[PDB]
Amino acid sequence: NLDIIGKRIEKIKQEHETSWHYDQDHPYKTWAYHGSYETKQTASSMVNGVVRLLTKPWDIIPMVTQMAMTFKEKVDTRTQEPKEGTKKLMKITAEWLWKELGKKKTPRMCTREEFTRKVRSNAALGAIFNKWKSAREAVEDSGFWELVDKERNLHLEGKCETCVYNMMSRAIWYMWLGARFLEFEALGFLNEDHWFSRENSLSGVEGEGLHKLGYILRDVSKKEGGAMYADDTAGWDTRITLEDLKNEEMVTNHMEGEHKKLAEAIFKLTYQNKVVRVQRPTTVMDIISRRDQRGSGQVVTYGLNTFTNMEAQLIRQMEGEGVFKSIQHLTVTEEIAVKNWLVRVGRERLSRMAISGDDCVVKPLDDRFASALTALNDMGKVRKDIQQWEPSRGWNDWTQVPFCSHHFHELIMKDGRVLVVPCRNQDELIGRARISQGAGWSLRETACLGKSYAQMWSLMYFHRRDLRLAANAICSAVPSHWVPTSRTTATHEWMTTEDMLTVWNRVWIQENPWMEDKTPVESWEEIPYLGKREDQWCGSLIGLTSRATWAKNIQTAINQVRSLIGNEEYTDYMPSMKRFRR
Ligand SMILES: [Zn+2]
Ligand SMILES: [Zn+2]
Structure with a gap:
């Protein structure tokens, strides 16, 4: 307890010595509570006007329009300690699984240089704004790295001062950039060197991409066995036990020298004991602590x-x-x-x-x-939306199994070759593309985000009639040479100014290990759609008068958006589809 967190606690107490107070009506039961201090502040979801002007029929679909409007009483729950037989099973399995994952991989520290490059091309590292503005700045200043050094030497000394979580079925704990570096230096190898690739871990899919996941599920279906089971856990991050955190720490048994010590420190000081600052409106800042549950970078968390x-x-x-x-x-x-x-x-x-x-x-x-x-x-991994002792319901058809918020179709091309394609309710796809995260966006930046969604749809969701048409419309409405963007980035092959037919051929034909015949596709008309009834089942508006008028008049919508952006070089992509080809 307080010997490992006290220093972080003491330190915060002193930056707000004119504020401190052991509040009496504090809501925490399962979180150890330590004190309060004075603050006052909150980023909501904005609409992407380029995508919405080119998807007018969806302006009257509540499932789309409600997505753009708008449990912290599950973070404050407690998991029991597993029985001795459970703990034995977990320790034997964990020991064996780290050895398997380590057979063909070498643990290693990640570098300042690696970390700098990451920040200098945007990854959602989850840091806080203070002393420098963005993450970009702090990384070039040498002061920062002295802060990092002090903390580092503190961690070699088995102590911690500045590795404090900031809270905000979601709960995202930002740390300052420095603490993220030290986490990345010690544990970044897991992601950076693809320990959870399918080749290395056999169960994993790290770095696959939606164009691979359906072929992977179909390969699993080929095994002799029973039904396919896909049980979700109710609040997975809240059910991580201190025994889980200790089996995860056994990766340090594969390490050596400094690295072994830096990794042990992250596990001991930041994961198996945590300090968190939370906003409460009655607006103060609460400094709470606990030993269990998940609180790490989003990437080590994965x-x-x-x-x-x-x-x-x-x-x-x-x-x-x-x-x-x-x-x-x-x-x-x-x-x-x-x-x-x-x-x-x-x-x-x-x-x-x-x-x-x-x-x-x-x-x-x-x-x-x-x-x-x-x-x-x-183990505390209680299944969502089913009584605790009710048997799981399995799936008899791999095309019905839900995985990574998707189902997968088997689609036969006119030339006999087999595509296994990702899919989800079209309202969800259209609703997400209509949302931008953050404000201060220029028209150009809003257009380049719409183009990223359009190119993703052409590559992954080309089989959905409404999305291929809307993707072609957006790519026609946005200047041909403007580069697609995203403010938080598996494989993202749509993030390119290369021609999308060439990228489709590389992803679905050339680099596709399940396709024996490598004959390139010469036009988008060779590339099939779902059956019209399957397209409707998965949320298509095909057959509605609203959708017919949109499709027929699409060049008018394209011209509206071109007029707003101004006199730029545009390409007409609509004749890539049969019905606009004269
Ligand atoms: Zn620390
Ligand atoms: Zn579908």
């Missing part, structure tokens, strides 16, 4: 979520196969049995899964998995 999810799902598979009888306690011969299962079939069982952070799909050996709930519930 890797450790994937790891701990892989662990939980191998254990649930062990329970379904009757590798152990009870979670109360493992016998000695049950430990040998668990160790032996892992060595004999562990890699085969990883390959039966697709795991992306807290999201999973499992194709178990058979349907006993559905009612194998004791380890899963005791």
